[PDB]
Amino acid sequence: APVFPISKVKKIAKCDPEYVITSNVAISATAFAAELFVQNLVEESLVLAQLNSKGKTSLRLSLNSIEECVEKRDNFRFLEDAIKQ
Amino acid sequence: VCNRWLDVLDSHGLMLEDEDLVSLICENRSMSKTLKEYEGQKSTSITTARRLGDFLGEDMVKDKGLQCKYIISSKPFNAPVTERAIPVAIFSADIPIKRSFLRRWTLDPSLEDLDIRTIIDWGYYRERLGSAIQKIITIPAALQGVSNPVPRVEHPDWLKRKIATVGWLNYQKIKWKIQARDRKRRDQLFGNTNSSRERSALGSMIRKQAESYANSTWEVLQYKDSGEPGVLEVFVTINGKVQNITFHIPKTIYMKFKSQTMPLQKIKNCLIEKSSASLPNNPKTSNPESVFLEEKENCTSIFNDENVLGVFEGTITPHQRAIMDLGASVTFRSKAMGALGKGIQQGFEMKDLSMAENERYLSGFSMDIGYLLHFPTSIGYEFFSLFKSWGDTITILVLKPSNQAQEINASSLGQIYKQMFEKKKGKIETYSYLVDIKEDINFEFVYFTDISKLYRRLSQETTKLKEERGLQFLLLLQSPFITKLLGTIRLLNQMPIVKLSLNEVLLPQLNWQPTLLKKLVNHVLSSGSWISHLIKLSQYSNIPICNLRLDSMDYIIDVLYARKLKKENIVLWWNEKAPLPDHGGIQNDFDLNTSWIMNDSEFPKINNSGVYDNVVLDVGVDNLTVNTILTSSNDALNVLRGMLKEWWDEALKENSTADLLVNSLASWVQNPNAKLFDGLLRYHVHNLTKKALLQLVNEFSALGSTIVYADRNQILIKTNKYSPENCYAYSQYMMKAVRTNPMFSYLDLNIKRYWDLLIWMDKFNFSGLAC
Amino acid sequence: VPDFLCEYCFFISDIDFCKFSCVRCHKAFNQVLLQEHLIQKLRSDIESYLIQDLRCSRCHKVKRDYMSAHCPCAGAWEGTLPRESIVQKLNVFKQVAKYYGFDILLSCIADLT
Amino acid sequence: DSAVDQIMMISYMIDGEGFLITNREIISEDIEDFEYTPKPEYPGFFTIFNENDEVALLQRFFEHIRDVRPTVISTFNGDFFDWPFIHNRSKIHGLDMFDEIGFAPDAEGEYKSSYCSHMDCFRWVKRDSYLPQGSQGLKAVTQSKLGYNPIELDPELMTPYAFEKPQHLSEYSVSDAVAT
Amino acid sequence: FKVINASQQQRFSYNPHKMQFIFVPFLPDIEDKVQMFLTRYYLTNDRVMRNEMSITPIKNLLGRDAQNFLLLGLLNKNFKGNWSLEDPSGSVEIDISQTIPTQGHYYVPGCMVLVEGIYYSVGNKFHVTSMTLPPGERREITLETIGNLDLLGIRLDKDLKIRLHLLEKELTDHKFVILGANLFLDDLKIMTALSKILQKLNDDPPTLLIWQGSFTSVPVFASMSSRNISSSTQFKNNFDALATLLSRFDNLTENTTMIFIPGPNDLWGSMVSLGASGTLPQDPIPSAFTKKINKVCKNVVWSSNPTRIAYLSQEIVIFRDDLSGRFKRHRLEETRKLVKTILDQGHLSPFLDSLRPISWDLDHTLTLCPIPSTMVLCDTTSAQFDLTYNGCKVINPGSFIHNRRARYMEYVPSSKKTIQEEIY
Amino acid sequence: SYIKEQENITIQDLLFPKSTIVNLAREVPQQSGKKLLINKDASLALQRGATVFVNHLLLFAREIAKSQDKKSCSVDDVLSALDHIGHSALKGPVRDKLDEYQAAVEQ
Ligand SMILES: [Zn+2]
């Protein structure tokens, strides 16, 4: 479905400093994988936000749950060096 | 007893093995807090933790509670024991990983051996055992009045003197590349514990794949050689799409030696059954299992089982194809709804799953078809056409010498496509729900000179068709000469590797009709009728598209023969890459006796050149090898007789793609390219066909018939002097009716031979025709 | 040379050294497969010459010992298979290799000298 | 860890009649009914309940607790390792533990309850068993106080044994259930 | 210096009185087969004569019932229970019970074993008290009875120098890579792995790399191996692909003496008869069949299986077969299976001709009377062992398919050590 | 190896929308929650995570592209790098939405 246009596809194509000539549908695959990654991190970060369900923010996720879901999991170990601010 | 333990610690454990030495010498010592919270302290549990943190990455030194098991080396000279710790995981890792990370801790790049008796400190373990034997042996003995009992250790002065009567992405990319170099080393150390760290949470992207997987019609068998072997890439087909899954396949050898091999090897599965395979071998009174390590065959050397006499050679199941015959072509995981998601994520363990189903109606479908076919010749043709069912554009990579112009502008191709399309439009309207070639074609050539960049253009066009559909398509590769040479260019897709075309025919450069009228467009309309032929040939034989099926029809016979051998359990399968014997010792002198020099079928000379009467031959016997097994090792021959008796039953009143199995079963015995049996089967069927030739050379002699020739295709009959040629019809039916009875099965037809007053010396005389 | 099989009409039949296509349909197969079959027949006869037994004039019994030079019998010492039989087969292999092209077959004939 | 991991087996012995609930996602071969009798005074009968998901495992375990109506809940080293792991796995899945069986922890981290009064038997080994410290685990207390040597396997190869040989791990979990 | 082939040397006619080299000069005789079995027993006869006590044949031990002599003989099988033993006088027969042999060796049908027991004079059924085959010897005694004649031609006694040992200890940049256990050139994985190994062997030049020849996967038989290609044309395509892959590395092309040796899967010349082991002394596949890989280099030498290479002080026979699968197949009744028969057996393939044929022409190519102090046993059923407790260094390059892939060895001939290297 | 530490140089590294991040957090788990809001520090972490993941997939596709000696990239080079980072769960639905994008981009 035409939901994510070529504007953000060209936004995520000029961002790379040293990149080889990729195809026009591989960047579309990376954009579809990026929205599924953001959906997987949202669904897997409420698995660790349910560990602290004593208050009203149990259905609402936050940075402490995001930080521990990034440092515990092995498929999200590339994000703890970029969560530091 | 301290001398026995000092002898086992003095000779560095040379009589002991390496696993008992690393379980004996090492020290289990876990931690309580993290590595970062132990700054400023120096101990052996902090040194092993720092070595695991810079050797196996930073992922295990994040959380607290690390179990740092260690050993102590000798090669750091005059250093403390708190900084001489080495983990046990450096000896379980690979050779250049341990050699790369050992020397940075050992501080010696001069070492060439990785033998554990040379690295570890025998003197630190000797002094810790010495202070324990010093206390409990030499400490209360000198005061009691007896001497030093152990002469290896000694006692000092205090008890001896009494005896006097964009920026930052470069750093991030190098950090992620070294981080994933340690994660692949973590998976190189063990292949299952890190794998279930992503599948511990059942997300809704694994559950959707688990709710959309039922009746997996498998399509192509594959390989994985750059990593763990024994795991197969399976392109199974779901109800609406095709899923690329992976299958874990074990190696079920028949060995019977698992009795006293329990502390020797690591026997996990405990199963004792009838693991006796009956093949002809050398020891007398022996007249005719599985594995827990699917990556390496660490088998036992010394054979003494005390159950039956005879060394088991390790007769195996076929390692690359033990799922297409033992399982099915239509795979089905019979279980609940929620375990198959873990099977999709890890890889399907088909040893405990993947049972068969009904094998009829394998492929009822509707999807796209890719079609790559190459045409090399002695002239430079190279017609690398790429037909696709959705794009309709074929791309020929032709015209290697670019000076002259000899290739058409698709005008002639379009006119012959129109005439061929009208005749095959009726033939295409028969098979149109599978392949739609019904639209009017339109295409463009690519006239190329180089070969390397032509393969680069070919790889760009196959990635173009693999990106235009992704999946839900089928690529039928059909190159004749370079069929196994086209497997280096493009891969990782489902492909019937088939030599359909024999060779491209030679042609003078003044026309192009034998290379374009029936070679290019007739092959894509034949590809439509050919995939319906393939649907029927894989619905009957029940094997996926891994077979040749037109050049070599010896694989379907092999899959059916392996299923017939798996129906029973006395006789088993054989070799896969060898010349395929069925003997007791594959690497021996047994096959020179079964070579059989010049292989004489028959050679008759009764010296009759001029025949006495006007006799006509109608004795043109075919299928004599088929009509030998249907009349007649022993169990392999009777299971072949039962398979051919069941095979002739479907080749009567209802047959479309199973009548070729009979003629391919005739051709299948004499060649080594055929699988699961050609060893003693060829010589035995040759002697039994020689016996059947000698039985049918005199049982048909109800009249005065004599022979002069016998070479399994035709013989000589002889009729009376009266009634020369008008009586052919009744003589032919009476000859067939008296020839069908003494052979007792009568499955060899005789049609239209020739004879009219012959002359025959031995081979150079053919005088006579009467048709 | 025995049992040549065709590619697709499956007519299994023997051929001769005195005349390549089928006798059922009509198409040439290749020349290198017939060339390969002739080196296979040559090596088969050479390995069958290599497994010759202890046989002579009086002692016409089977050979049952390797370490034994000759039988404790009264016959003159000779052999089982003669070299003149395989050199007559080697010159008919050379005649069928030089009558036709057959480069690797004559190459292996030169290799065994 | 209690959030990156999941429980594979629950081996419980309700008054002589043992039970076992296994997670079919990690465990490959589904375990059938077997026996573990290391001595004739300790009979072990274990009807395995092969639940597919971990939510099914935890709900069948809490359903069997809610139907059997226990008056004593025992385990070895409960409040330190065994009991908060099940509270974190019941906090991860939608059904929280306190809403069905009343097992809320105290201020010091001890999983007490109102009706059943949880019996952590590692608070007897550390208190007055007169056992030497360094050999106070479950294997050494059953080799010393009880008269049999149980199944001695290292816990670091427990996870590859879930996918490879689950019958030996079901024997080990039934061993520590009849020993507890 | 140069590679001594299977037929490119003088013929060593070992006499029973002096064991020297006589002048023989295209097809063998039966007299040479009788001399072959006589040289198989008479050259192991001096393994206890020059070691030492009383030596006498079975003719002095026929009519009795109690004995003392260690009966040296090769094990046979005539009938179902007719275990025959010999010497060049007659024959002895061995029973099947009271078996207690030395468990530091391997017994097989054809290894010469000393035995002791009773005679059992009703018939001739010798018994087994002690079953131990004799061992070999060292360098100082193996070449003193040979006189002053050569192996390849250096016929002078100039090899008693320690400057020849300092000539082999001087250039320490010598490299003898063994490379490993018969690679298959059909799958792309072994091709990419040999490309990476040639990259790491291209940036640093060796001196004489013992490569791995005859590398087709399927053996050549009397049928077309590929789809439309034959079994001769598919291997032509495979050595042309190996020649184009070898010409992508231009450092091995000049100084590295690449040596090609077959296995049991040789080309169209020597392996279309057999499919399992064939004759062990083979002929090398020459320039007549292979043409494309010979023009890409100037240091490619083709040689057979039991072929020594000269270093003027050292001989290295690089054998290739499944010896650990053949010795395991014949018992009495990975590491410790071939470390027990180098000294104990002076023949490279101790079997009869009915179980392993040897050509009657060449039998002094696989004999081990000049004992090598460095030896290569390339197998496919063994491990990477290196045991030197005798003086002979025996290395075994294992395989390519195990848990970690791409195993290959690197034997330094100057430092006399060996190492192995994986790459993934 | 180590070259330099981290750099908060977010002048050009602050580009992705915020409405798409909160649009990609629907998540209905069959009536187990209300799903009212997400705080802004988690939305800034999700924006930086999406940008870092797109750079992650591009370096992993280019690092497995050089092993096959191809100087290009593709769908069979991007999705053959998704198992190297441990994300096969993303690989299956990216295949069905890529085939829905290819089945709807023709019209
Ligand atoms: Zn034909």
PDB file of C-alpha atoms in Angstrom, chain B residues 28 63-64 67 190 192-193 196-197 199-202 207 266-269 292 294 335-339 342 346 349 351-352, chain D residues 1 3-6 24-30 52-54 89 92-93 154 156-157 159-166 168:
ATOM      1  CA  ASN B  28      34.489 -22.883  40.109  1.00  0.00           C
ATOM      2  CA  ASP B  63      24.272  -8.106  34.602  1.00  0.00           C
ATOM      3  CA  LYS B  64      25.517  -9.460  37.906  1.00  0.00           C
ATOM      4  CA  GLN B  67      30.118 -17.698  36.923  1.00  0.00           C
ATOM      5  CA  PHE B 190      27.467 -23.019  21.553  1.00  0.00           C
ATOM      6  CA  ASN B 192      21.410 -23.083  21.165  1.00  0.00           C
ATOM      7  CA  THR B 193      21.457 -20.894  24.305  1.00  0.00           C
ATOM      8  CA  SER B 196      16.413 -18.769  22.453  1.00  0.00           C
ATOM      9  CA  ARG B 197      17.189 -15.278  23.796  1.00  0.00           C
ATOM     10  CA  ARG B 199      12.394 -16.249  21.063  1.00  0.00           C
ATOM     11  CA  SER B 200      11.810 -16.082  24.826  1.00  0.00           C
ATOM     12  CA  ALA B 201       9.034 -13.528  24.217  1.00  0.00           C
ATOM     13  CA  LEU B 202       6.372 -14.726  21.780  1.00  0.00           C
ATOM     14  CA  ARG B 207       2.571 -15.617  16.134  1.00  0.00           C
ATOM     15  CA  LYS B 266      28.583 -38.579  24.878  1.00  0.00           C
ATOM     16  CA  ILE B 267      25.636 -40.899  24.346  1.00  0.00           C
ATOM     17  CA  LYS B 268      22.516 -38.804  24.904  1.00  0.00           C
ATOM     18  CA  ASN B 269      19.827 -40.840  23.161  1.00  0.00           C
ATOM     19  CA  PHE B 292      23.866 -36.611  19.011  1.00  0.00           C
ATOM     20  CA  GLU B 294      25.101 -33.772  13.521  1.00  0.00           C
ATOM     21  CA  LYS B 335       1.334 -30.367  16.946  1.00  0.00           C
ATOM     22  CA  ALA B 336      -0.503 -27.519  18.695  1.00  0.00           C
ATOM     23  CA  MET B 337      -0.729 -23.792  17.868  1.00  0.00           C
ATOM     24  CA  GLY B 338       2.294 -22.085  19.440  1.00  0.00           C
ATOM     25  CA  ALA B 339       5.344 -24.359  19.212  1.00  0.00           C
ATOM     26  CA  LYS B 342       9.649 -21.471  17.920  1.00  0.00           C
ATOM     27  CA  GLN B 346      15.127 -21.633  15.516  1.00  0.00           C
ATOM     28  CA  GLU B 349      13.624 -30.193  14.343  1.00  0.00           C
ATOM     29  CA  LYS B 351      13.575 -35.730  13.949  1.00  0.00           C
ATOM     30  CA  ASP B 352      10.767 -35.313  16.511  1.00  0.00           C
TER      31      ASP B 352
ATOM     32  CA  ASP D   1      17.413 -13.022  34.757  1.00  0.00           C
ATOM     33  CA  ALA D   3      12.662 -10.731  32.317  1.00  0.00           C
ATOM     34  CA  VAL D   4      14.840 -11.944  29.421  1.00  0.00           C
ATOM     35  CA  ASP D   5      14.079 -15.579  30.354  1.00  0.00           C
ATOM     36  CA  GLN D   6      11.141 -17.932  30.820  1.00  0.00           C
ATOM     37  CA  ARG D  24       6.332 -26.812  25.033  1.00  0.00           C
ATOM     38  CA  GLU D  25       8.102 -23.845  23.378  1.00  0.00           C
ATOM     39  CA  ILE D  26      11.563 -24.513  24.808  1.00  0.00           C
ATOM     40  CA  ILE D  27      11.091 -28.255  25.357  1.00  0.00           C
ATOM     41  CA  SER D  28      11.167 -30.050  22.002  1.00  0.00           C
ATOM     42  CA  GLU D  29       9.936 -33.579  22.780  1.00  0.00           C
ATOM     43  CA  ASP D  30       6.784 -33.647  24.899  1.00  0.00           C
ATOM     44  CA  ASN D  52       1.976 -25.135  24.938  1.00  0.00           C
ATOM     45  CA  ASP D  53       2.502 -21.545  26.084  1.00  0.00           C
ATOM     46  CA  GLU D  54       4.030 -20.123  29.284  1.00  0.00           C
ATOM     47  CA  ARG D  89       6.757 -14.059  34.912  1.00  0.00           C
ATOM     48  CA  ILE D  92       5.027 -10.140  32.410  1.00  0.00           C
ATOM     49  CA  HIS D  93       1.921 -12.100  31.391  1.00  0.00           C
ATOM     50  CA  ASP D 154      25.794 -28.763  36.307  1.00  0.00           C
ATOM     51  CA  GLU D 156      25.177 -24.324  32.861  1.00  0.00           C
ATOM     52  CA  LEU D 157      24.124 -27.049  30.388  1.00  0.00           C
ATOM     53  CA  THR D 159      19.393 -24.796  28.556  1.00  0.00           C
ATOM     54  CA  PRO D 160      20.959 -26.980  25.696  1.00  0.00           C
ATOM     55  CA  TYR D 161      19.399 -30.023  27.404  1.00  0.00           C
ATOM     56  CA  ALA D 162      15.951 -28.447  27.005  1.00  0.00           C
ATOM     57  CA  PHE D 163      16.126 -28.706  23.228  1.00  0.00           C
ATOM     58  CA  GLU D 164      18.305 -31.833  23.057  1.00  0.00           C
ATOM     59  CA  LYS D 165      17.440 -34.319  25.849  1.00  0.00           C
ATOM     60  CA  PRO D 166      14.404 -33.197  27.877  1.00  0.00           C
ATOM     61  CA  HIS D 168      16.918 -36.382  31.587  1.00  0.00           C
TER      62      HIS D 168
END
